[PDB]
Amino acid sequence: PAVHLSNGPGQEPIAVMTFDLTKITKTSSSFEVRTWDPEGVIFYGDTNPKDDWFMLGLRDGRPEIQLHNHWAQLTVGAGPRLDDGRWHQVEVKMEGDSVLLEVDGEEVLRLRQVSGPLTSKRHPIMRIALGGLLFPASNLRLPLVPALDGCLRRDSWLDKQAKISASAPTSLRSC
Amino acid sequence: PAVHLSNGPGQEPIAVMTFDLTKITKTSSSFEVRTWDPEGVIFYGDTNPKDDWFMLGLRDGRPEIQLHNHWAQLTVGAGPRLDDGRWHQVEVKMEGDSVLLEVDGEEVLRLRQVSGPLTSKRHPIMRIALGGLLFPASNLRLPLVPALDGCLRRDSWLDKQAKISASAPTSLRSC
Ligand SMILES: C[C@]12CC[C@@H]3c4ccc(O)cc4CC[C@H]3[C@@H]1CC[C@@H]2O
Ligand SMILES: C[C@]12CC[C@@H]3c4ccc(O)cc4CC[C@H]3[C@@H]1CC[C@@H]2O
Ligand SMILES: [Ca+2]
Ligand SMILES: [Ca+2]
């Protein structure tokens, strides 16, 4: 079962989850995505939308990560185009001080020395938003148009042990 | 004709070129590299080894860029392993405010918003060192052992119009 990553004209995420970082052990997430859209947000995460935030999206068909925290601030593209209408496996892992991006079983990007441990963030509540940002797109380091006309399936985010809340799936729309 | 990227035990580059940035028009370089070595420096560049420097190397077989300037400071891995004993084409381009890395005809990395124009650097003299750094390896954001047991060929760096000086090829060693 797959869900649409955008619902209608709005830019809002289709879903938000929140996690207690004092209870994280697994610091990775995995999902499959399918789209013909070259630009948009796949997911956004933060502990503070002003001071500690992360965005995985597509620009010109390829993955783009933007992140802004006390240790690093960056806008980076990598990997193959994904806007070919095929399902693609994506894994985004925090390992040590690094963020790893794997696409279709291949590591395509490693941002080294970019974060302290999730355990120790100043604010111990992490949000993950699917298909949109939790601030205006103009707040990005490099704006894009967030709407991603795509589908998401087989998605797991950190683990249930850490999860405090998840948005109502009443609004989710099947693909 | 190919040359070795390391000569004996020392860490020093095998060659240094310097350029007048007031005369650059082409801001890209291209070469082929072949190695079985998973770690080392391919080339280093700077306008100031303290304040504005760039390194392309291999770590765990894959490209790594480190760069430190007024606008960005980063350590990033991307692309496939290159330590498979095959010749690989590499192109490193500055385009707008971005650095592009292309391997075997595929863009594998785009560092966006990382530099002002080469035209306008505070110091208008750029050095490019092949096979080594122009400071101690401990000065890197993330140290590696610089010696790269590999070969380089078909290399062009910016253009001759901009070049002020090039090291004596008396020390270069053929592969
Ligand atoms: C933990 C994840 C990778 C690392 C991400 C990160 C990494 C650094 C940072 O300062 C904030 C965030 C928030 C979102 C995190 C992501 C949410 C899911 C993904 O697996
Ligand atoms: C111009 C090159 C790409 C951009 C590199 C860069 C990029 C940003 C910066 O602040 C310094 C340097 C120095 C070395 C430059 C490289 C030397 C050859 C390569 O093509
Ligand atoms: Ca879009
Ligand atoms: Ca080596």
Label each residue of chain A as H, E or C.
Answer: CCEECCCCCCCCCCEEEEEEHHHCCCCEEEEEEEECCCCEEEEEEEEECCCEEEEEEEECCEEEEEEECCCCEEEEEECCCCCCCCCEEEEEEEECCEEEEEECCEEEEEEECCCCCHHHCCCCEEEEEECCCCCCHHHCCCCCCCCCCEEEEEEEECCHHHEEEECCCCCCCEC
Q: Whose CA is nearest to atom 7 of ligand 2?
A: B54
Of A76, A79, A141, the CB nearest to B76: A76
Burial of residue B30 (CB within 10 Å: 0-12, 13-18, 19+) is: middle
The CA–CA distances, whole Å, from B115 to B63, B80, B93, B99 equal 20, 25, 12, 8
Domains of chain A (ranges; CATH) run: 1-175 (2.60.120.200)
Cα–Cα distance between B170 and B23 in angstroms, integer?
27
DSSP at B170: T
Inter-residue contact B132 to B57 (CB < 8 Å): no
Torsion sign over Cα A98, A103, A105, A106: negative
Per CB-CB distance under 8 Å, the chain B contacts of A113 are 75, 141-142
Q: Determine the atom of ligand 1 nearest the C-alpha atom of A91.
A: 20
Q: What angle do CA A97, A98, A101 make, to 5 degrees?
A: 160
In angstroms, rounded to a whole number, what is the distance separating the alpha carbons of residues B122 and A4?
A: 49
Placement of tokens 């925090």 in the chain: A94
Q: Which two tokens stand for residue B148?
A: 């790269």
Alpha helices in chain B (DSSP H): none
Q: What angle do CA B93, B96, B102 make, to 5 degrees?
A: 25
Contacts of A76 in chain B (CB under 8 A): 76, 109-112
Ligand with minimal distance to B19 CA: 2
Read off the tokens for B137.
């390896």
Name residue B57's beta-bridge partners.
B41, B64
Residues of chain B with C-beta less than 8 angstroms from the C-beta of A79: 108
Strand ranges for B23-85 from DSSP E: 28-35, 40-48, 52-59, 62-68, 73-78
Residue type, B124: P
User: Buried (b) or exposed (e) across A137-151, using 16+ Cβ within 10 A?
Assistant: eeebeeebebbbebb
Way it was determined: X-ray
Q: What is the resolution of this structure in A?
A: 1.7
Residue A113 has its nearest CB partner, among B80, B109, B141, at B141
Distance CA B156, CA B26 (A): 11
Closest partner CB to A112 (pick from B75, B106, B109): B75
Q: With beta carbons under 8 A apart, name residues in chain A contacting B72.
A: 74
Task: Verify whether the Cβ–Cβ distance A110 to B72 is below 8 Å.
Answer: no
Cβ atoms of A33 and A43 closer than 8 Å: no
Both structure tokens of A11: 């830019």
Task: Give the dihedral sign, CA B60/B112/A74/B47.
Answer: positive
Identify the three-state secondary structure at position B7. coil
Nearest CA in chain B to A73: B72
Is the CB of B108 less than 8 angstroms away from the CB of A78?
yes
- Residue B76 touches partner A, C-beta closer than 8 Å: yes
Nearest atom (ligand 2) to Cα of B91: 20
